[PDB]
Amino acid sequence: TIYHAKDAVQATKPDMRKPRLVVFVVGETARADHVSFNGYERDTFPQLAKIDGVTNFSNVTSCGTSTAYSVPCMFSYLGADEYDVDTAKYQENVLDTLDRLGVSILWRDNNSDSKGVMDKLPKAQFADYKSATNNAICNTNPYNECRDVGMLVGLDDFVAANNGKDMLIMLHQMGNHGPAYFKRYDEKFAKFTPVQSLINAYDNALLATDDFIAQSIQWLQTHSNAYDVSMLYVSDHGESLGENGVYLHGMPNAFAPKEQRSVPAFFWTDKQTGITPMATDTVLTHDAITPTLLKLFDVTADKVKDRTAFIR
Ligand SMILES: [Zn+2]
Ligand SMILES: [Zn+2]
């Protein structure tokens, strides 16, 4: 219904330059201040720390404090100041734009769903990875809960099916959603014990996300010969863990504590892509996601031209 980027155009197409392949990990309930890179006293991201090419952003603010509110905003043209959750799904979003310009879009979801973001695109481009019908990694724990790494299975098939095209893959993580954080990770990540126990479980869940992001990057690396590959991670909101008597998330922005809106963001790219990240301490928000995705595929749109991205 409401358009934002009818003028959008891709400056270069994949027939005259290397095609581009991006994984966008849409994170869940992760707090910036529980990231080792941001000064946390526990090493919650030990695998990512060993990977060259990873930029950590230390000053990122979410649009809101819930999945329902934040996720459509992350893909919106409006920005946090203008965003309206009720009317979001009736507006053209950045995936609509990229799809129209020929970028192959895939959304795998181990969270809930895309909160309206994928609704205008063909049903076949969204896939529910919360069920063992699609996810091959579900029986590794007492709860039979499907794991985020299951979303990486068979992604080569998608690349093959779309070979030579630009591709953007969204992987919507279960991540750190609670309150039962101890359910969110398999036993091999139960590092911080006992499961304060609530904090420990929270940090163990971050370890499993560290693992998932690291494996996402490794998967991308295997395609770097044929594709310009990059990985963007941003959490949809943080989490209160008892500060001032506040717990969980979803607090209205007017009263939301810092903990619920201070989120981690990472960017990784292969050396050959020529993509340059912004400074780690750039003042950033969820508003930066749409311009970042457009830039990664060499797309310009009038509405977002003044906007700061995660990359130059
Ligand atoms: Zn939630
Ligand atoms: Zn969420």
Author numbering: 219 to 413, 425 to 541
Please give me the paper's original passages concerning this structure.
MCR-1 confers resistance by modifying the colistin target, catalyzing transfer of phosphoethanolamine (PEA) onto the glucosamine saccharide of lipid A in the bacterial outer membrane. Bacterial lipooligosaccharide PEA-transferases such as MCR-1 are organised into two domains: an N-terminal inner membrane-bound domain predicted to contain 5 transmembrane α-helices and a soluble, periplasmic domain containing the putative catalytic centre. Here we present two crystal structures of the soluble, catalytic domain of MCR-1, revealing this to be a zinc metalloprotein containing three intramolecular disulphide bonds. The two structures are essentially identical (RMSD 0.37 Å over 311 Cα atoms) and reveal an overall α-β-α fold, containing three intramolecular disulphide bonds, typical of alkaline phosphatase or sulphatase enzymes, with the N-terminus indicating the likely position of the five transmembrane helices.
To facilitate such studies, we engineered MCR-1 to lack the five transmembrane helices, generating a construct containing residues 219–541 (MCR1ΔTM) which was purified and crystallised. Phases calculated from datasets collected at or near the zinc X-ray absorption edge ultimately yielded structures for two different crystal forms in the space groups P41212 (1.75 Å resolution) and P21 (1.55 Å resolution). However, the two crystal forms differ in zinc content, with the P21 structure containing one zinc ion (Zn1), coordinated by Asp465, His466, Glu246 and Thr285 in a tetrahedral geometry, while the P41212 structure contains density for an additional, also tetrahedral, zinc site (Zn2) coordinated by His395, His478, a water molecule (Wat1) and Glu300 from a symmetry related molecule. Whilst our structures unambiguously identify a zinc site (Zn1) in MCR-1 adjacent to the essential Thr285, the Zn2 site in the P41212 crystal form involves crystallographic contacts and may not be relevant in solution. This possibility is further supported by another recently released crystal structure of the MCR-1 catalytic domain with phospho-Thr285 (PDB 5K4P20) that was crystallised from conditions of high zinc concentration contains zinc ions in the Zn1 site and at a number of additional positions, of which none is directly equivalent to the Zn2 site identified here. However, less complete conservation is evident when comparing the putative Zn2 sites- while the Zn2 ligands His395 and His478, and the adjacent Glu468, are also well conserved between MCR-1, LptA and EptC, these positions vary in less closely related family members such as choline sulphatase suggesting that an intact Zn2 site is not a prerequisite for activity in all such enzymes.
